[PDB]
Design a protein around this motif. Structure first.
Motif, PDB file in Angstrom:
ATOM      1  N   UNK A 183      45.824  64.823  13.602  1.00  0.00           N
ATOM      2  CA  UNK A 183      44.900  64.011  14.379  1.00  0.00           C
ATOM      3  C   UNK A 183      44.212  63.063  13.533  1.00  0.00           C
ATOM      4  N   UNK A 184      44.026  61.871  13.688  1.00  0.00           N
ATOM      5  CA  UNK A 184      42.966  61.000  13.315  1.00  0.00           C
ATOM      6  C   UNK A 184      42.171  60.428  14.362  1.00  0.00           C
ATOM      7  N   UNK A 185      41.109  61.246  14.526  1.00  0.00           N
ATOM      8  CA  UNK A 185      40.368  60.791  15.667  1.00  0.00           C
ATOM      9  C   UNK A 185      40.867  61.017  17.152  1.00  0.00           C
ATOM     10  N   UNK A 186      39.896  61.420  17.939  1.00  0.00           N
ATOM     11  CA  UNK A 186      40.135  61.039  19.375  1.00  0.00           C
ATOM     12  C   UNK A 186      39.899  59.600  19.690  1.00  0.00           C
ATOM     13  N   UNK A 187      40.727  58.919  20.398  1.00  0.00           N
ATOM     14  CA  UNK A 187      40.396  57.405  20.584  1.00  0.00           C
ATOM     15  C   UNK A 187      39.875  57.460  22.014  1.00  0.00           C
ATOM     16  N   UNK A 188      40.235  58.279  23.181  1.00  0.00           N
ATOM     17  CA  UNK A 188      39.968  58.190  24.564  1.00  0.00           C
ATOM     18  C   UNK A 188      40.026  59.747  24.897  1.00  0.00           C
ATOM     19  N   UNK A 189      39.133  60.083  25.973  1.00  0.00           N
ATOM     20  CA  UNK A 189      39.094  61.318  26.577  1.00  0.00           C
ATOM     21  C   UNK A 189      38.548  61.129  27.987  1.00  0.00           C
ATOM     22  N   UNK A 190      39.426  61.368  28.761  1.00  0.00           N
ATOM     23  CA  UNK A 190      39.002  61.450  30.251  1.00  0.00           C
ATOM     24  C   UNK A 190      39.051  62.733  30.756  1.00  0.00           C
ATOM     25  N   UNK A 191      37.826  63.368  31.238  1.00  0.00           N
ATOM     26  CA  UNK A 191      37.989  64.760  31.751  1.00  0.00           C
ATOM     27  C   UNK A 191      37.042  64.752  32.923  1.00  0.00           C
ATOM     28  N   UNK A 192      37.730  65.631  33.960  1.00  0.00           N
ATOM     29  CA  UNK A 192      37.113  65.780  35.222  1.00  0.00           C
ATOM     30  C   UNK A 192      37.446  67.071  35.972  1.00  0.00           C
ATOM     31  N   UNK A 193      36.237  67.199  36.609  1.00  0.00           N
ATOM     32  CA  UNK A 193      36.395  68.652  37.404  1.00  0.00           C
ATOM     33  C   UNK A 193      37.314  68.348  38.736  1.00  0.00           C
ATOM     34  N   UNK A 194      38.197  69.553  38.880  1.00  0.00           N
ATOM     35  CA  UNK A 194      38.909  69.543  40.066  1.00  0.00           C
ATOM     36  C   UNK A 194      38.765  70.969  40.645  1.00  0.00           C
ATOM     37  N   UNK A 195      37.711  71.201  41.615  1.00  0.00           N
ATOM     38  CA  UNK A 195      36.942  72.412  41.789  1.00  0.00           C
ATOM     39  C   UNK A 195      36.269  72.887  40.331  1.00  0.00           C
ATOM     40  N   UNK A 196      36.665  74.084  40.031  1.00  0.00           N
ATOM     41  CA  UNK A 196      35.972  74.601  38.587  1.00  0.00           C
ATOM     42  C   UNK A 196      37.230  74.559  37.383  1.00  0.00           C
ATOM     43  N   UNK A 197      38.188  73.654  37.607  1.00  0.00           N
ATOM     44  CA  UNK A 197      39.046  73.612  36.604  1.00  0.00           C
ATOM     45  C   UNK A 197      38.944  71.957  35.901  1.00  0.00           C
ATOM     46  N   UNK A 198      39.238  71.979  34.756  1.00  0.00           N
ATOM     47  CA  UNK A 198      39.223  70.601  34.262  1.00  0.00           C
ATOM     48  C   UNK A 198      40.396  70.116  34.173  1.00  0.00           C
ATOM     49  N   UNK A 199      40.854  68.878  34.341  1.00  0.00           N
ATOM     50  CA  UNK A 199      41.833  68.062  34.210  1.00  0.00           C
ATOM     51  C   UNK A 199      41.892  66.856  33.334  1.00  0.00           C
ATOM     52  N   UNK A 200      42.421  66.895  32.339  1.00  0.00           N
ATOM     53  CA  UNK A 200      41.994  65.666  31.333  1.00  0.00           C
ATOM     54  C   UNK A 200      43.231  64.942  30.667  1.00  0.00           C
ATOM     55  N   UNK A 201      43.008  63.645  30.437  1.00  0.00           N
ATOM     56  CA  UNK A 201      43.946  62.823  29.578  1.00  0.00           C
ATOM     57  C   UNK A 201      43.180  62.308  28.335  1.00  0.00           C
ATOM     58  N   UNK A 202      44.036  62.261  27.176  1.00  0.00           N
ATOM     59  CA  UNK A 202      43.571  62.063  25.732  1.00  0.00           C
ATOM     60  C   UNK A 202      44.552  61.098  25.071  1.00  0.00           C
ATOM     61  N   UNK A 203      43.895  60.280  24.278  1.00  0.00           N
ATOM     62  CA  UNK A 203      44.552  59.533  23.230  1.00  0.00           C
ATOM     63  C   UNK A 203      44.100  59.990  21.889  1.00  0.00           C
ATOM     64  N   UNK A 204      45.307  60.362  21.243  1.00  0.00           N
ATOM     65  CA  UNK A 204      44.625  60.636  19.623  1.00  0.00           C
ATOM     66  C   UNK A 204      45.148  59.389  18.906  1.00  0.00           C
ATOM     67  N   UNK A 205      44.521  59.166  17.680  1.00  0.00           N
ATOM     68  CA  UNK A 205      44.987  58.642  16.606  1.00  0.00           C
ATOM     69  C   UNK A 205      46.135  59.479  15.711  1.00  0.00           C
ATOM     70  N   UNK A 206      47.082  58.663  15.157  1.00  0.00           N
ATOM     71  CA  UNK A 206      47.837  59.216  14.111  1.00  0.00           C
ATOM     72  C   UNK A 206      48.190  58.355  13.300  1.00  0.00           C
ATOM     73  N   UNK A 207      48.712  58.977  12.206  1.00  0.00           N
ATOM     74  CA  UNK A 207      49.013  57.901  10.975  1.00  0.00           C
ATOM     75  C   UNK A 207      50.116  56.901  11.581  1.00  0.00           C
ATOM     76  N   UNK A 208      50.033  55.691  11.261  1.00  0.00           N
ATOM     77  CA  UNK A 208      50.955  54.617  11.867  1.00  0.00           C
ATOM     78  C   UNK A 208      52.227  54.990  11.183  1.00  0.00           C
TER      79      UNK A 208
END
Lengths: 81, 81
Positions: B20-45
């Motif tokens: 992992x070369x950094x977290x580019x993007x993270x969207x995390x939201x509550x659905x009741x008491x649970x988290x649902x998340x979408x993430x983009x990681x950097x990687x070596x090209x």
């Protein structure tokens, strides 16, 4: 449960510190939204008292660094195995 | 803040996965008491697409294992550096 989750994080964090032989005791309680905790870790019986005190301080640093809601953490050590 | 704490744990967990070369993007939201998340990681090209997909799967496993309230986590990768 709410407090199960935090207690599992505390134990896990402590057990990953070099020289911890298990968490013997953990009492964690809410003071408002903060956790105050007291813990006993196992250590090698043949560690020196000075080394066991360093381990305690390393557990305090590790646990406090990983679980931000903890505002007080008292760690002591007991011989195990 | 409440969601700052969980988001900092997610990022930290992801950044400790090999490749992992950094977290580019993270969207995390509550659905009741649970988290649902979408993430983009950097990687070596110059990683292969197969390797980048393995890294994504390793991030998913690491993050989901460390943060129990997460019930959905979608990870993708983008070239970084």
């Amino acid at each position: 449960s709410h407090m199960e989750a935090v207690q599992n994080r505390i134990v896990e964090a402590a057990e990953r510190v070099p020289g911890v032989r298990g968490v013997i005791h953990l009492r964690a309680r809410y003071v408002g939204q903060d956790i105050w905790a007291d813990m006993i870790i196992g250590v090698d019986p043949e560690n020196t008292v000075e080394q066991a005190e360093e381990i305690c301080e390393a557990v305090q640093a590790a646990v406090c660094g990983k679980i931000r809601r903890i505002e007080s953490l008292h760690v002591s050590a007991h011989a195990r195995e």
